[PDB]
Amino acid sequence: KQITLYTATFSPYAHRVRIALEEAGAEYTTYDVDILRNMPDWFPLVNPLKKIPAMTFGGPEVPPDQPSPESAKIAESLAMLEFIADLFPDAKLLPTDPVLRARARTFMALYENYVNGQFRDVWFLGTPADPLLQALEMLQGALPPDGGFAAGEWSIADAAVIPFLARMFPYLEAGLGLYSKEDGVKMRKAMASERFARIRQYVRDCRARPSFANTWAGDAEQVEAAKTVPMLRVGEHHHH
Amino acid sequence: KQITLYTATFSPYAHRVRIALEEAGAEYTTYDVDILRNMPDWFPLVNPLKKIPAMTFGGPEVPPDQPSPESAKIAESLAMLEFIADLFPDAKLLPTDPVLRARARTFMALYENYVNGQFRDVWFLGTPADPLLQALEMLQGALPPDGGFAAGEWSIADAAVIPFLARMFPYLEAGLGLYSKEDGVKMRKAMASERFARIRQYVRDCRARPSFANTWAGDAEQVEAAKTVPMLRVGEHHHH
Numbered sequence A, B: 001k002q003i004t005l006y007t008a009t010f011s012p013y014a015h016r017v018r019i020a021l022e023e024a025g026a027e028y029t030t031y032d033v034d035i036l037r038n039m040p041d042w043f044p045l046v047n048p049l050k051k052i053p054a055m056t057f058g059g060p061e062v063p064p065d066q067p068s069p070e071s072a073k074i075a076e077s078l079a080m081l082e083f084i085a086d087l088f089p090d091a092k093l094l095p096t097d098p099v100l101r102a103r104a105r106t107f108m109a110l111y112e113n114y115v116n117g118q119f120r121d122v123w124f125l126g127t128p129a130d131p132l133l134q135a136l137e138m139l140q141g142a143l144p145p146d147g148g149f150a151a152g153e154w155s156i157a158d159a160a161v162i163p164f165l166a167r168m169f170p171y172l173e174a175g176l177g178l179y180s181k182e183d184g185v186k187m188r189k190a191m192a193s194e195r196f197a198r199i200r201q202y203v204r205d206c207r208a209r210p211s212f213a214n215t216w217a218g219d220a221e222q223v224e225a226a227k228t229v230p231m232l233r234v235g236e237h238h239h240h
Ligand SMILES: [NH3+][C@@H](CCC(=O)N[C@@H](CSCC(=O)c1ccc(-c2ccccc2)cc1)C(=O)NCC(=O)O)C(=O)O
Pocket: A010, A011, A012, A013, A035, A036, A050, A051, A052, A053, A075, A076, A077, A078, A119, A120, A123, A163, A164, A165, A167, A168, A171, A229, B113
């Protein structure tokens, strides 16, 4: 059955799903959608929430911009990750052991509930960096301290998290986001300090997999795509 | 292997996992924690995030207030729901079909990402009710139109969502929450109107299951428990 993923280079959510699909060895189509600046009129037929990513599954082979009513319409990046794991069980995108599977789901929830919001607020609103650094420390503390991925072996939990952590470093080095220069230097100093060695190793470990290389536009390209986001008003910074 | 769930009557998050455990037919212990008013000094050993629910799994049989370092410590309610589904496959707490499983996962993400924060903000900050009503209408649109549960058959997705929806109605009737009188009126009228027939049926159907009845203190008892929650300042309301 066919898979079509509606994507955008500047969407870390869509990135999650690309990574999973790579790890699964899936056959799939990707189709870019200019969701923030010029959504196509047909897009609400694949996702009525008007968000990227969106996925169609099965139905007749059709051009992405002519979706078919017969395909299943699948929304929400984390639901997609679990769906891909269900579709491709021999790819072992989750552990088999219940407790280790629980570590992956807990890690995804920790990221979604306590970290992701802080990234948004700091980068889009320029709120203080310290609560984000705290949340990143908490997340780092859920990793196996001696090495490995969230649940040991690689799982969809690492697909869920690497798109945001991998963007953090080059966006900081490029100055992109609404936070102050002061909070910028503070975040760059923290993320380079020994406080955060474990998370740097994790980013290295996730980035080294072909699933990241093959779904990453390059750091400089990703910075460029991110400047096309209006909520990231380039040249704007909030202070205290 | 033993299951201990650390609970509180006023935690809709813990309520989720009680429902799932009931639907699994599991043997388990529950243990209340006065998490907001007087957390026991040992509680960070079962959950370093200091939130309810917490779960221990396995290790030796010990009193809940003397947790053992050998038990698995499982945090985050949705991770616990998937864990229980994983532990008790014969209970069919998720569909076997992958598209149907994705409906369950999508429904949980729609709730967590667009509805839950509106409930929290309206009840605890008195933010405007209209965005909550719009998010509820969106969630109601994901239900199978003719009846049944989020993924057709009952699944953990309905354990995830019913604690919150089931609380909304008696909380409105008791005037519980920091929203204005006007928005209280608006919400009470909206949730009684034909616009939300479908979600009323959903609420009734979820509530009719023994998993709800056996984990619910009763409408007034839950109202009373909610009033013990600090951030529900009795006598405070916000107006815009
Ligand atoms: N819960 C959904 C969310 C999807 C979503 O919001 N999609 C966006 C894509 S655009 C999000 C994005 O461009 C973005 C960019 C950068 C970051 C970020 C990264 C690193 C550091 C700091 C911040 C975070 C988000 C959309 O379509 N939005 C359209 C709409 O909601 O109308 C899911 O899990 O699929």
